[PDB]
Design a protein around this ligand. Sequence first.
Ligand SMILES: NC(=O)c1ccc[n+]([C@@H]2O[C@H](COP(=O)([O-])OP(=O)(O)OC[C@H]3O[C@@H](n4cnc5c(N)ncnc54)[C@H](O)[C@@H]3O)[C@@H](O)[C@H]2O)c1
Ligand SMILES: NC(=O)c1ccc[n+]([C@@H]2O[C@H](COP(=O)([O-])OP(=O)(O)OC[C@H]3O[C@@H](n4cnc5c(N)ncnc54)[C@H](O)[C@@H]3O)[C@@H](O)[C@H]2O)c1
Lengths: 299, 299
Amino acid sequence: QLKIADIADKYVFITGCDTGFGNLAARTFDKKGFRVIAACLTESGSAALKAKTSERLHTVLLDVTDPENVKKTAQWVKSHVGEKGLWGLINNAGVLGVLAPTDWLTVDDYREPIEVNLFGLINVTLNMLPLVKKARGRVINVSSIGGRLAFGGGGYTPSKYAVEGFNDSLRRDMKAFGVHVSCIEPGLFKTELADPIKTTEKKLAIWKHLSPDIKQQYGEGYIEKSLHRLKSNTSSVNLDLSLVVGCMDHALTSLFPKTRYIAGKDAKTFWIPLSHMPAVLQDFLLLKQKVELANPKAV
Amino acid sequence: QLKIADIADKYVFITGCDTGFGNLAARTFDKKGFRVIAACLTESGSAALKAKTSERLHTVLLDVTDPENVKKTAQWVKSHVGEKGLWGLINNAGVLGVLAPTDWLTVDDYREPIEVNLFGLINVTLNMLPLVKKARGRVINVSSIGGRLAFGGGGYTPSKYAVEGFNDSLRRDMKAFGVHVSCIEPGLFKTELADPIKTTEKKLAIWKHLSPDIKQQYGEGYIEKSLHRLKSNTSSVNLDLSLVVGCMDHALTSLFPKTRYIAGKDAKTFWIPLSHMPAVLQDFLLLKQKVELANPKAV
Ligand SMILES: NC(=O)c1ccc[n+]([C@@H]2O[C@H](COP(=O)([O-])OP(=O)(O)OC[C@H]3O[C@@H](n4cnc5c(N)ncnc54)[C@H](O)[C@@H]3O)[C@@H](O)[C@H]2O)c1
Ligand SMILES: NC(=O)c1ccc[n+]([C@@H]2O[C@H](COP(=O)([O-])OP(=O)(O)OC[C@H]3O[C@@H](n4cnc5c(N)ncnc54)[C@H](O)[C@@H]3O)[C@@H](O)[C@H]2O)c1
């Protein structure tokens, strides 16, 4: 490790710092000596993070889906960092949206994850990019193993796939300016993103208004038996969020940041390898646990 | 080839039949004996296709981004096909949108390709899916090599990446119902999608309102020198659209349709293989031709 020098003079802007990876990142980089600009969705998330950190850290309220708030925040960063520019941008904010079988969904159900995870990431990136160029800095995009292998119906999968493609377009565009772009692909980690109970609640809301034929095909208590698989293999969710923040740290401080980081033991040894395999192999493995439908010929 | 039987009794719904792959598909499947429902964006595209085809083919006007038009069209198909259901759905409609360096763009520039290529594809699929299930039929999604390797800035890349992820979610959801889902990834083909002159026109529109610093970094006549690469290797664009329609034909008529079809000699032998490689190899190959910026240190 030849690391960069003058960490103490470099600003890092992180989206989604109320909870999860982004909260830990803000705290970690603050203690490391970066000047953190921690964007938070909520006032109480902002106040808690500020109470736990040093005077070098600033919080800002940002909803990444509000283009006016994005532009104002970018103007604030620009005046604050001046001719240093912005060394790091971590695009971390994201949401799961509704996860359910594709045939239960409307197109509207896909919009929310795409708006936060893709469009919000793009708009933040585009508004901050002049500052990153100025610093010859680093853009870090948080994708997912779900951006390389599709885990289930709903907008989250397409959102993360799209982030992988944008990431690569951005990287090649930014090579000429000496800006590095890193994509981080975590496996499953215990955060506020996904919560089996909340996922089940969304499915029950949808069930209420599903067509009779769908309900006959899947069967009453399909959702109950679904919750009993989400639970029945929740023992392989990583608790150590520092595995992901450690990737962010390398992307920000190495003289040789990677183009892709994979976080989680199963992610690197199994999931990302499988993402290269054709459907015949993937489908066999992923369908193993899926709950049998009650009446699949009721079409 | 054990092919399916009773082609003459099966309906195939194709989006975007005014020009390109979808026009050729409609004509080909009409002559093959399918009952084609050819959705066209324009009246003159519809009238031309109808004049060239048999009485077995019906045209409908459909803009896939208009959810009311989608729902009405799906109701029309439902009444027409009755208890046969819909054997085939070909999601072909798509647009390029603006292609330009990422740092020239706003978030609004990404919306159009995503709305047609991703959201329109999803909404058509979801509205037709009960009919395909009824037939135990086939969903064919037209992706791109640009859904596996990012070709340049703009919304087209993320749109196609997203289609790959949706495709796979849909496939695994639909396995229980005996519905097959095929993704087609063409290389470059001479259609109305991409046209260097039209691409250059969009860049000039953007240039007019770009910041002074961007224009200094790229340099006046960057766009002129850009057009002189688009031209300077346009000799490897496939003219034979039947390579793609041949993939669609297999997906619709084989008893063993593939999960993925690749069309174009360079696509199968080079591009899709390279899509598996890390960025260090991809970037080296793809940046070879890119036009040097005039003043990249002007940040
Ligand atoms: N936890 C996992 O298993 C996992 C796996 C792979 C990828 N990821 C990704 O990690 C990132 C962080 O999520 P997490 O797991 O820490 O979950 P989390 O819900 O704990 O954190 C998400 C953060 O994003 C913020 N946020 C949500 N909507 C926002 C909006 N509109 N504007 C601004 N901020 C917003 C939330 O306030 C929160 O601070 C996301 O991109 C997620 O997709 C998570
Ligand atoms: N030609 C290529 O090099 C190439 C390569 C890979 C993938 N593709 C894909 O092939 C598909 C077909 O495009 P093409 O190459 O034949 O181009 P094209 O422009 O000739 O055909 C596109 C078709 O989609 C229709 N369409 C456009 N917007 C629509 C909308 N809102 N609603 C309904 N119909 C709409 C157009 O009328 C036309 O019929 C697209 O998904 C494209 O992304 C093309």
